[model samples]
Target chain A: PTLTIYSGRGQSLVEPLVKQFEAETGIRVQVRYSTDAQILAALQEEGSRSPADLFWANTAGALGQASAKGLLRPLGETLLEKPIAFVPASRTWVPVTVRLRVLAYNPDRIKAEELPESLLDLPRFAREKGLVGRVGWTPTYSSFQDMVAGMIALYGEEKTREWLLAMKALAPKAYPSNPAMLDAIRAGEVDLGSTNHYYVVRFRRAGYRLGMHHFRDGDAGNLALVTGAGLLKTSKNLAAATRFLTYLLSPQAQQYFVGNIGEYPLVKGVALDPNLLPLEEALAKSPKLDLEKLPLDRALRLLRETGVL
Target chain B: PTLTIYSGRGQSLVEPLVKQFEAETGIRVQVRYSTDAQILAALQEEGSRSPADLFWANTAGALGQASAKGLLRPLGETLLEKPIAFVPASRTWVPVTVRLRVLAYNPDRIKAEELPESLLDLPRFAREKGLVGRVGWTPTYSSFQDMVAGMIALYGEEKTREWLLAMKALAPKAYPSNPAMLDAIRAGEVDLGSTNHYYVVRFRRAGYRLGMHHFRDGDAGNLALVTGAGLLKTSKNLAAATRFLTYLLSPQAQQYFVGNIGEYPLVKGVALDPNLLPLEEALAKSPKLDLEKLPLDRALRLLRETGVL
Candidate 1:
């Protein structure tokens, strides 16, 4: 009757949906709210005894890591008819939402015209524009890690390693999360910050002097990332867990995410936000990323070896 | 709000205390019924993610196995001031009750005077008394394995191995559990069956025409074996789990186990059953058993190597 959730997501965004689901389905939910790293650590410690029904990850590569560790069960054919980025080959987890990776800049310090249009040009941008210590990035943020993961998969491991080290010398005091990075840009400490589309849209709607920049079509910077859900193999309440998954993929839940939160709903029939780019155009501009094969562990190794602390 | 139990105890005997505790404490309860072997396998599969609050084993060596696997968390020291055999060196699990090892015999087919009084004498008894193809044993039963483990510790591995091989030539239609062995004895398929005391008492009380025979004082078959309770390291509800442990050791639960069930209670200040021997006499008869150092894994190898099953 009770479903336990390990939510690797913001409590503010997940709580409302959970409450609505509980009220509608009459299934009690105990949600453990924490960061992706802590949740991942909890999974590692608990292993197969983990009582959690689901890992609802808003961050990148967490679902992948959970699958990699065999902490999740292979889901039944439930939501597999989505985009390639939304569908991992293992089918150990399901993607809930698609998010566009982007660069957020401050107008006071820089112009959109002069900024590097592709992440491929960031090394040259820092060198040619004398922009050292002026570009802010969240080093350990999960989304950033997925971006790095895709970079490794696309640019080859060696090229990504070189690119990482190139930016290492030019980067300023790094942030731990999107809010901190965006805050640094607002404080005029950095001109640019790497984050997601919804993040920039929410901040800009709140009257912040922030500019959202999308890289040219098929650039790794504009690569698509998905927020994912995985059912813990140890979950006792499988039916409830499955039902919760069903609810999240339903039109009602998708509507709230797409219309209210300005997130790209990975499923069809959900109303799209007018302020956001259409899915067709967005997917066309994004680099082809094999979400399942994104070498997250390898990328993490490179990041750590490059001293991107 | 709910405490989850991975109950290795029988449902009939355990449900009474569970219902009583639920009513008294107003805490919800969820019990997963399973065998000790199945629970051990479950723990192995779940690793650090196991959600069960307690192991609550009714058979032998399970507490040792759980502790050995690092599946159990240490207790709060509230229940350690009991008998030495009731305490494990690891202090990770608690002993709940004591059950003397006994051989169930079919009186219509066999005479008690001709039976082996100690486990060490079994090989000679089986050969001389012609019990070959007539003595039934549950080689895989946890209780039997504990007896074997104690045998290896007290009698030495070589002697135990020899004795095991001696009986290996005589064991008939090996059963996987306690009830199956008893059923074989009852049906005249085997003249003798190895199991525990309370099982025979319950069957005799129901007029099943069964006889229970204990080994001589300080013998391996007469040594004290305990039903155990372990708090899982993965337990999210520590308060609820500890409360359940506290309630089980209370006089009410102890009285049910001692008086109605006719088993020896491990904790002090509990009423003694007139049908059962007093703790002083009982302990005096049982061989010195290091509950912690019982080499179960060694015994299992000897069992398999001797081809008992």
Candidate 2:
């Protein structure tokens, strides 16, 4: 049976793996790839007429919203071995991969020992270490929104807003994406940049002398965002769709994540790229983030309120 | 007041973080670092009179054995934010860091697409792909034992023994450590090696062409071994010990795992090195492994019986 997948993951990452799945299982996969928003919009617009058997999302927040809107169906209890934070608690979506929030720094500009201990310490470090305008961040990135949402979930709106204000006071330069932020750090435009962990690895592979600082201790700064998938309620090829989901969690597909691209594989037994920390350790470092519990709307509002967006 | 810690984690990883806790909180930490076996033996010898406030373990298995012997104390519900696979289900110990079992491959020798889909497929792939002695593994390593234990837990003794026999038939070269295994891969002594994810990162940091393969599909081949800590019943300074435990989970200390050393941090909100996969993704990949439930003794016996030891 043929399966149609609505994917927010880029064409390059999903195409080769889809082709491999087709060769292995003989299940023809027709993938419609686009941004998370565009895919979500398409799903919402099509509703019962949607040809998508699966919604391969780039963000769990969008998946959660899709679930809330009744666009997704549960794959039953047996699909996932255990629950993860980024998956919808209602089992409407399953996380496929993850990206971690991290700090990128120029080693020449700051010694490892001189870095701030926590995200909470950044403002103080900016003032005391005279690092104002020496830091960069992306205030508008959806990942940043998710991080703020996690902060709201763990520390409440007041604390999140306060941190955002304090962060803004650092007068950090804003970038369009994590790579841009790392680029700023590499160019010595900023001593530090707040971005996801993968970008630093990519830059390092290109011979950039950058270091990553993980803000541990359950700080909101260390949130790991998920790129997930959901079974469309409109799927006619339910069995094939289930098999495809199973394939995504397979070792072959999972390894593709590490070797082909630098994403964190969500399935067990898939070895991550050596450049990435093991998923268990990343979860340990991020105790406060529960993807299911994040208050996304409030976080977006807080970001806007703090003039960070 | 002073806190005493008997740690199996290396001094280089623990000492500086302990000093930081002392400096930040004014709680003096006296650390006695040693191997897991020695520390466990000392705790057993001293019993209730042990001066150690906390047993910082390098393996959750040691902590599990200690908890079974009634040598540990529970810190109630609030210490760890959530339950981890490696931590005792009884909550006697909390995990601090982790190492993942992954395949290290010489990318120049083997294409990523040519890799097997599961660890179970390796024996066949060895014959079909002419891998045989081209692969390296460490039979003596505790991590390998743990992986075997997990296999026994998931697949039972007969299947575990069968896989072990097939694996042995492959006539894989043995190494003392994960680094040694990776070195074999790098030197072309072996095209592929079984090792933890971190070793590949370390080698890559030195500019070697190596890639990691994570065996997914709920296979026992994908196991995550944990390094954890627990409070001792003999501790006199309970308050100070509790603070110290909290401090270890802090962002600053957790960052030490990702930055100073390429280990997975157990605490949340700590960013992992960009070169490492996020912990949540790793855990998602390893849903079948329950550290508390792994049949370690039986696994050891099987290893011995199957001639893997």
Candidate 3:
């Protein structure tokens, strides 16, 4: 029987990889793609009737939720060499790639010295410099929420609330998406915005004059969020599902995520994307983000309560 | 001398009120308008040197942050009759208007029976019925984040994460703003979306066949986020600032917000917008949202980690 998979990532991102897997294994595959939330919902609704043999998630939160609900089976010990933070504590899922949060700034409007020492210092600095309306932020972006969750895990709720209020007080221009925020910075609408690192790299490659500031000193600004896959408990084709997970961790799949997607590969041996800061360097500068421990629901509620959502 | 004010609200919303205040009180108001963040930054940069006599803010988070930095002076006894949840513990700022979060759904595509019991049940219902890709959301919208933040405060981290991931898994089509998500629902591109209450009312008033679902269970989905104002501690014109604060809470000013702006009037005597559910009813249905206590930074980090932002 063919392996049936549910994926939260876009079809464009997953189709090529699926083709590659199918080509290599000669096993037919059935793929249904939506978003991580939809995939999770479908699984919950389908329960034991779900056709999904493997769930390829776009975020560790989804995988963790599935694992918590007993929807995911414990992964075999094939790809346990990756960073522990990227994997679930339950060992129910395996991370395939990663994305880091970063600050996108315009050099034309801001001086190097004017940048905050850390993400936590940004609100005060922006206010001190009268850069409140001159900055940009995306509160509703998933990547943004993930970063906030990590902050809560690291700093507790009180400190995080203070920072958020400070940032809100800065009155940064809000954009609906990261690209829009980047476009605003590129167009000189705002001097700076927070976004995923890869977007800036991609924009720079396209000849935009954007720069990314990494929050060193292990601040919450430099968070690494993972995208991973898990075996479904309802899978009749366990061997095929396991094979797919193995193939994802293979050097070729790792290379695809790094080279093509401009994301950090979780497998240890894959060469880092030339455009990205070295994974080790980025991780060292970032606060330890335990995705499994991340309080996403609480964070979203806080966002809603704070009017930042 | 003219009363100098720095306003974070749109000029359209504040201008008429300012004119009315000017006409009635004979106080010539000099306004420099920007977002709450910009105004806060300018105030910080100016310090005691600021020309602004008052700061008219759009969110309590901005007001709270300003108060925490000692940028604001207490309001004394004005507007103390409003709900305690909308008032900061410090009492340095006063609520002006309020917005509530609700589900904006297209009845043509979704049945009432198909609707989940609460906001938390949405993900599973969307998924089980193969409605994953058919749903819509604006994860990057500030209103959405505020709701997420509230969820965090009420549910703790683990449950919120599960909900966020499941919502994400539904693979809801992303829009840049709440209006855009409403537009998508109108176009039948998706069946439902999460947005502030006023938007759907505006759309319905404009003749769209859209309906709003109030998550009447006092869930995070039914949270009330407040917009407010404060007096700068450095003000040279405390009398004018106090007068402006008084006017904002006046029945006439409150009516302007509810009647013209379609927002909930924070002042108790002002009538609710006819298009909206009664304030008492709405508040009764909403989870008690304390904007001052919301952990926005942590929530943003969680959104990022969960890939919902």
Candidate 4:
């Protein structure tokens, strides 16, 4: 009678949506929040038991890890079939929303045209332009590691390692967090920093000097990640769980992503906020990498080898 | 004692702050919300009778109109004197957060370097580049009118009228709202539009194609506006009202303005969000016009004469 979810998505964003679903569908719903890793850990340890009817994730990889481990119930064709971009043809989970990596820059310092054609060419651009100490980076951040894992997934360790080494040798300033990276840029310490597209997006209202570069389409530099949800194969309330996932993908919910939460909606035809690139263009710019299958070990190895860890 | 406020600032943003003040000082607060223009009308019509202790505006211009009409109480030196930019030497209202006018453009179509040096040169650039029809505009939006009023405030009617006429001849695609104008640019109907800096700032989270141009510092084209508060000369609870206004300017509330609301905090040393120009820089970009004394009639006349109305 009640739908319970281990929601890895932030409660601030998901709570309202769940309440709305509860109101409209007349179905009681409960959502508990935590990181995708923690939820996966609990799910793995607990075995075929259902802590909740659904496992909603903040990252695609978490859902992928579950699907691979046989923790997810395979969705029906109706739920799996979506016109949205980035949905896996044979995946077990439903893609919810999107977030991508970007380089945040100070427009006063760098002209948009002067940016490199790809993030892969960042080191070359840095050296050639005497930008030796101007780039902002967060070496220890998990998202930074995820992006490095993406680089390893798209290209082998050798190429990823070389790029890392080249950039490391270029001597970029290391920062603790994405927001701090931009603050450093604002303080004139660096010209640009590696950050998620949404961070700069959120900051735009409070200041107008920063810029975001998504890189050229389909480049490994412009990595894409998604938030998603999977049904627990052992769910006692399968009907309510399926309906909740469907509600999350509804047009109203997608618009909530655009308006309130500031995420790229995965649904096609959903109107994007004015500052974001169109979903088609954003997806086109992002390289095709399996978020679930990203090479974490290779990325960490390269990070340590390059003295970035 | 209770504080009564006729607040023109957005409720979603101001309500919580008011409650915070209420809780902190244990002085009950009653906030009635309406547009700045509407509040001005009621205040003017209501005469010396005190319906509210304070007149908090969504715009500096509204505060200016009240100041001009002697609808506001002159503040004590302690409250009025601050390190903030753009405050009058003996102003009646306390300026809160800033909003700026900017040109939002598509970087894919027009490089930042290619942008005109001043908003004054927009028409010349348009004609030279044969951008005859590739511009977005909103003639009916109140904010757009306020920007035109800014033009008249900085430059006389003759220059503003000429600029308006010249740009009107350029044949921009008129849209209903700021968001629609950006949507047109996204659809390739137009490459850029005239909008408040904050409009594009909010949109940045949803998309990344658009760019905001706060033209060279001190240009009339890059006008600055502020949300502000004015004490009623007819206040019944002067002590509580004064404390309420003071609390609004406190560091805690100022940080709230930056973190929760996307406005440039007026108080010096209040850090801006990464996307905004530093307060000093944004203030420098704004013309030294008396926002309280902007020529709205002249702006409307010019809009009509130029066929923009």
Candidate 5:
């Protein structure tokens, strides 16, 4: 039987891998795709009658929720060997690759040492420099949410609020997506942007000097999040779906994800591009960011309070 | 001791209520503010030494992470009167307001019924109608993440992938935020867009004839999420921080969040704008979406696979 898949990531990212899976397993695959939001909603609506065999999402939160809700069947020992941080405590899902929460800044306008000690320091620095109009971010983006999650984990509520207020006072130009924030910063609409590591890497590779900050000592320091894979309970083609999940975290799959696509793979023994920061280096420098324990609702409220929603 | 708060929800969203709280409790308040992500990351970085007394954020996933990490203190019975769905399962955070996910389509280009029944149908519709380049969405936005959370809760993993792949195949244009998507729709950049209900309403108020799809047939249908508040464990001013959380969930605060900001209030007694879809109505039509149960990682992968990242 063929596996039907619904994905929220683009084909340019997944198609090569899908073909690789087909080549290795000799299993036929059918696919449909949308934004991450659409894929999750469809799964919820489809319920027990769904035709899909696996759900592969890059963002960690929805997968965590699915496992919590008993919507997914655990992968047993199939995905236990991966080397990513914050795997589901239940093992219902497995991480495939990793990306770090980083500061993407214009090299010409800001110095690496001059960057704020933490993401929270950004607002205060901007306000003090009167560069609020020159700094940009999307308060509602997922990576931004991850940054917020890191905050709630490290600081208690009251302190987080005060810091949020300081940031609000700076009034950084709000954009819609991390890439857009990067665009705004690259175009000098804003001098700095906060995003996952690869957004800047992709742009910089295209020949711009948008330097990224690997926040070293502060709570707002760089934290890497693992993107994962899992088989869905409603899958009629369980074998094919399982094969795909296995391949994703396999060294071969990890190499494809990292070497070609510029993502950090979770499988051990997989080599990444030289330009990319090693996952260990990134995580070592990153503050302790617990994805499973984020205060997402509080973060959303803060976004609204700042008028960035 | 006084509590300091940094919020994205401006004083305007909660200030009048904060005043009422101050009048009742005589507690002093200090506030720091920034967009949602900034506040979230800051809280994490500061840890025990964090400056604010409470952490108030608008995004659900970020709030959930905070609660999961033990950064939030368990709130008291004072907030018990608020609606249960509006608060976190752990009671560490409570919702002050709500918003619904909707299909924001241009009326001049398409009719409401002509819209896809579910988000899954969008890709097929786009392919059949040549609407690929004519449809748009904010790929990395949180509301979009919440919507994905809804899908993971319903469809399981397998079906979610197929739907995501379809969306990728359709190759819809990507915008970073709702306003830009709305603007693009208005400018005919795309015939339709996906966004929160309030955004479409705001756009409509500005004289755009945008139609919305309620998407309520199964669990995937009619997704709604809450924006909530909570006190941080490391808050320096527990009394003030607790008072602020209570105030935010109070009738006055709920009214402010709903009336002034156009978000749906969590307090049972607070009324929302007549033009907006009531939470109860939306819930009735929506498939049961357990925000806690969504497979967030899977959805993120789907997006990554689809090349929306």
Candidate 6:
């Protein structure tokens, strides 16, 4: 039977790999593309009769939500060699890639020393007399929310809220995402912007005159984001899906993912993207990030308390 | 005695609030500014001999690190109240502001249908074929890392890693920050970008041509981050430091922070930025985000695996 995979990531990223898988395994695969939420919602709504054999998305929150709702199936050990540590032992889902949150700035507008030590400083700097008109950000984006969450996890809600209020006072020029914010700063519309690290790398590679500020010391600085995937409970093609999952963890696939996508490879022996810092190097330069204890709920409440939607 | 605050945030965001506190409490205050990391690092390095009276930085990881390292002094109920829900009960730090992660997209470049159903889809789409030169993101961003942590918390670590590998396959053009990624798409360099909610609001307010793609479904899609403050162990002015911390969370301070900086306030019974969505509204529109269950450690490791560092 052909396996149907519904995912939030675009088909471009998955199709080639899927094609390669199909060619290697001689299994027909059908893929549906959508966001992690959409795919999860579709699976949740579809219930036991869902067409998807696998569910893949970027962020794990949606997958976790689906897993909580029992939308995903526990996979067998054959799919994994040593029981992938990143995935749960229950095997409801698995990760495929990763990313990080960082401050993107224009080297010309602000020196590293002049910039705030953490992502939280953006608003404060924006509120400063000489810097009010010089800063920009995308407060409404998920990445920004994640940045806020990082703060809550590090500090506490009360202090986080105060900082949020401070951010508002600074009157930072806002946009939809870090890229737009970066562009404004690069175009001289704003002197600096907040964003993830790779955005700057991509833009720099593309010839955008931009720089990056990694907040290695503060509460909400230099945190990384992970892009992952999982198996669905509604799937009938367990064997094929398992194979695909295994292939994803293969050194070749990991290398391909990193080399072509500019992401760090997770597989034990894979090389990293040259354009960006390797995962080891990045971690070495950054402060210890304890993902297990990140205060996501506190950040959410603080966001609400601060009046950010 | 006058209290000095070495803050990661700028003066404008907190100046008015500090002035109001000074007016009410009859206390003199001085403020020194630096990035979030700088403030936190300085506090850590200074140990018990720092001259600053107060230490405040972005939320999430920093406060936790400080508290764990015994860099802060706990506050009492008089200065911080109980059920201080949004803020942690550690008595060492408190949150004052908040923001949420969101997806910022260009309606013209990408149709609503084309948008991934969730943040996870972005990485997947990056690997897909039709999306070649289309998707953009801050893969290494901390916000993104938090999102991944959420997944690791919800799903098992192995599953999280597998999903990350898939995201890596997408070959997405990684950017450093959310704003830069959004800017690229806005400039027609890409089609869409993921970022914080506030960025979109600020940009919209600025009359920039951009739009937001709210990851609808649940809490995972509407991830949040909180910014907070704390008193350092080495604070030179205990009285002033306590006052500054208290002032930061005062209802008046919260209101002023939100009003001037355009950030959501932390205090209860406070109004949010008029231009932004309240937490209640956002929660209603998005899915439920369970903060307690997010696995931040696994997510960080996954990012390392994916080479997003």
The lDDT leader among the candidates is 4
Residue-pair clashes per candidate: 9, 38, 69, 18, 147, 197
* lDDT-based ranking: 4, 3, 1, 2, 5, 6
Error of 6 at B24 (Å): 67
Candidate 3: stretches off by over 4 Å:
A82-85, B1-309
True contacts kept of each: 0.00, 0.00, 0.00, 0.04, 0.00, 0.00
Per-residue alpha-carbon lDDT of candidate 4 for residues A1-309, written as tens digits (9 for 90 to 100): 688899887786677567657766789988878888888888878776655789999887788888988888888878777638656644689898888888888888788898887877888877766788888799987678888898877778888888888888878999877777876776678888778887776666433457888788777767787888889887999989988889778655665565455578887544354457767787787788767787766788889988998
User: Candidate 3 chain A: minimum summed lDDT over ten consecutive residues — where?
Assistant: A266-275
Backbone clashes in model 1, listed as residue pairs: A46-B48, A46-B49, A47-B48, A47-B49, A48-B46, A49-B46, A49-B49, A49-B50, A50-B49
* Candidate 3 docking classification: incorrect
Q: Of the pair 3 and 5, which is ahead by TM-score?
A: 3
Q: What digit string (tens of lDDT, one per residue) describes model 2 on residues A211-298?
A: 9788865767788777778898889899999888887776556545644456676755443444567667766656455475568889
Winner by DockQ: 4
Task: For model 3, state the Cα shift of residue A230 in Å.
Answer: 0.8
Index of the highest-TM-score prediction: 4
By TM-score, the candidates rank as 4, 2, 3, 5, 6, 1
Q: Interface RMSD for candidate number 3?
A: 27.8
- All candidates: TM-score: 0.47, 0.50, 0.49, 0.53, 0.49, 0.47
On the 0 to 100 scale, the lDDT of residue B146 in model 3 is: 74
DockQ of all models, two decimals each: 0.00, 0.02, 0.01, 0.04, 0.01, 0.01
Model 3, A209-272: lDDT tens per residue?
A: 5777877757889887788888888999998888888877765566556544557766654444
